[PDB]
Symmetry: D2
Subunit: 284 residues, 4 copies
């Protein structure tokens, strides 16, 4: 049996909320209806929050602009902790000049541009420049010819002893009510089905992003990890990750974990959320 609790009822226990984005705040057809009231509410209550997301397809500033376009003005770039920030820091620290090859769009790659390094798509790599490729990043499922560039990526990683990096996204994402699409994490998975495990994956259920947020909160208040709530739709990323780091966790049913499957999934993985809620929408 599941005890379903209202999200509003939980909020007084916590000094900060960590929200996953997809399946929690928004879905394939935009924001979940009413989700603005959640952020109005937290503001009115003076409650801190962050978005903690395994999206490295654009910068925090751009992720924040997408919410502003959808009308959620409360969410600023400083509130968005994304695994792309980890990737960027890893490249700056661990890659010594040359070229970083990427699978994705030019826009996805612009966030990573820096001094000393040239970003190039996999499509632009051949024998004439392969010796300068010092890393591979997988950023977005769109923006390149798969037949051409998945093939080239396989050969690039056979020929160059370099880090291959992706955000730990789900393997697929919902595109319509009926259809899913293969995500950038899934493109890595498919590559790894041919080559073996090979990708450094950043993001949940790792705890670096959580530690960053936690540290920033500790700079301005008394707070312990159990006084933070991680809110997510996915057991093996949001809930598992939150739990390992010591966060309380709330599973919402508006995403990857459907109500009919929750007990079964919880029982097969042994990943137990602190709380289960229908959704993160607070009714006005």
């Amino acid at each position: 049996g599941m005890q379903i609790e209202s999200f509003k009822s939980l909020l007084p226990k916590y000094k900060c909320i960590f929200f996953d984005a997809f399946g929690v705040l928004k879905t394939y057809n935009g924001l979940l209806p009413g989700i603005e009231n959640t952020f109005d509410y937290l503001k009115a209550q003076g409650q801190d929050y962050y978005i903690v997301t395994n999206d490295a397809s654009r910068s925090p500033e751009q992720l924040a602009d997408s919410y502003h376009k959808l009308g959620l003005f409360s969410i600023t770039a400083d509130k968005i902790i994304s695994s792309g920030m980890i990737t960027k820091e890893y490249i700056d620290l661990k890659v010594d000049g040359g070229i970083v090859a990427y699978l994705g769009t030019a826009n996805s790659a612009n966030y990573l541009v820096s001094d000393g390094i040239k970003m190039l798509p996999v499509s632009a790599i051949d024998d004439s420049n392969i010796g300068e490729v010092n890393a591979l990043v997988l950023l977005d499922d769109e923006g390149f010819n798969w037949f051409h560039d998945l093939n080239k990526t396989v050969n690039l990683l056979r020929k160059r002893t370099i880090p291959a990096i992706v955000a730990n996204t789900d393997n697929t994402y919902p595109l319509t009510k009926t259809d899913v699409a293969i995500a950038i994490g899934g493109v890595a998975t498919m590559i790894e089905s041919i080559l073996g495990r090979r990708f450094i994956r950043f993001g949940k259920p790792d705890s670096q992003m959580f530690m960053f947020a936690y540290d920033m909160l500790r700079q301005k208040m008394e707070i312990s990890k159990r006084e933070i709530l991680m809110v997510g739709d996915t057991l093996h990323t949001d809930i598992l990750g939150g739990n390992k780091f010591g966060l309380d966790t709330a599973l919402v049913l508006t995403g990857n974990t459907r109500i009919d499957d929750a007990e079964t999934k919880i029982k097969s993985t042994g990943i137990v959320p602190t709380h289960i809620c229908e959704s993160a929408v607070i009714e006005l």
Copy 2:
């Protein structure tokens, strides 16, 4: 230590040879030089042979035509036993009319054309005809847009309770001296990394093709399974497959199993060949 034996020196022990094609008779740049003499030799000695191949991208007649183009005229379509034959028989028997969806080229699909069923590429499947799709076959890595149609195949299989069939090819094939290409079996492998295991795979190391050839030999001579030699470059398909069926096996070193790696791969898999030879090419 490996005992390397001349292929010629083994031939007297055997009443029929089964040859894998790729890595044994031919490679990325055509026929292995001299392989013509092997076939001249077997004729002059009156020794039977078949080619037993997991290539289901063409009919046996077209597979034979490819050898004719390359100058190997003695290879006839009756000597080519291909996993595409199994696929064809499976469709005829187990699929009841409607549409068979495919990933490949129109030419790869032609061999499977039959009464009652329409072959269509996954690209031509939509809500208007999906309810009539009764099987999916993976035939060739070329001939379709991977971004579009790998996504559509994921969704097709999520929506239709139908058999998904592929030839059990290696996940990759050599394209040049340095580069490989993802093969149709590898495409299935990639799909399966997203969906889970889901493809019915035909061909080596299964034993149906062997049994078909064996039964034909038995109709014209006294022969036991150990009097047949399976010749291949791949442990987990040719050598494992042959051994399990009772055939003697000869590992050649002209393909997937490189000489520097043979002892290690043999030890790590426990797949032991009866004999190890440098190649299937016979001299003089």
Copy 3:
């Protein structure tokens, strides 16, 4: 969709029935009540049967004797086709003298012996004789010390280039209504989790036992693949194997596939039985 049919109604189409044993003829509770009616009916109708089983824990004669002890005298050793028989033949034809080491009971091992072979349990292997050990077979989850001999097995296979062989059983089997036990196939799975894929697996869904039965039947009568029904409770062994070999398949719901899960398991695997039936027990 999920259409259940009468098993008895199906049977006049066929000259021979192949039955899986566990979950079909019997469960942890012993014989399925009334299963004798089925065999009496087939005998009255002039229909043949064979048992096709991946239980290779004892000889066909002892497997038959175990039915006799339970009061089912219609099953005789000459009608039991066990994957143990493939193992025995492999040892005879593909292992050249020396020792064949085993995990199991002495009773499971000794009858596998043939001229030139010595069976030995793993517990008896040492530096002095490891050199003579020419194969490993896993026969029964009982009969050895797990701590000592799973460790010794791991080392044996790291040190010796030998085939490692097991019946393709499910990983676990029901002991009681609530509890399962790890089966011998599961022990192999566990070892492969440490070492990687390493075991030759005999039995369903491979075609070898099916071919043997079919060969024998065709000597005694005019029989096609259209006149043989394969009856099983497990999709990925019984149903998949039968389908690939060209047989009609009947999934029964007295074993691994429960009525409440059948539709979803068929959908997820894409393994579609020709017919679904509650039981292989007929009335009257």
Copy 4:
């Protein structure tokens, strides 16, 4: 390419060294000869150290005592960061009273003892106490009967929705020059081969222990991630974890990564250490 450097030459960059223990400070043969020099030198230079180890079979105090018994007094309990400490914290913060079941020895369970939870071995769990079991921990590959308690463990986890917890050890460890033993992490791996992924795994390559050490250091001094070197013998735990956390890494060749295999293993994994050294043992 593979450039070996002097370990001692590296050390002046750093304010603190994090050492892995097995394969770095000691092997199956005991302490690496001369390893005391290394700690003497760091102390002389005013440099700090911590041990960062996925050995959670004993408490930090017992782990330090084991060094003292071998004559290495420079390692003290307060400098040992063990993944056992994360397990302890997880049990305290996330497990609400009741029983914690364990696989291991009584001594290994001892440090986990707390006010509110009873420790009991899996062997002690039956129908009378099972509803009170609120977690399982795997602690040590010794101390239990594998046949009875691995079977019981599989049933325990099938029946109770509880977290299953293990240190992320390698699957095996060396006993002697020729033989390995299955480690506690490998036992979890085996269980997961039967049940599917099911264990929470603590330790490298996770960031948690790294974060702890760093948090402690930054209280006592001005220290950045650029002034900490992680030293280990295993790519997928030590080097990978160190790198993802933003640390310089040193691969040493005294343990799991041998000098003959380093270049190949680095190439296949894409896990690249900042530095490669023969040994953490310095001269003088």
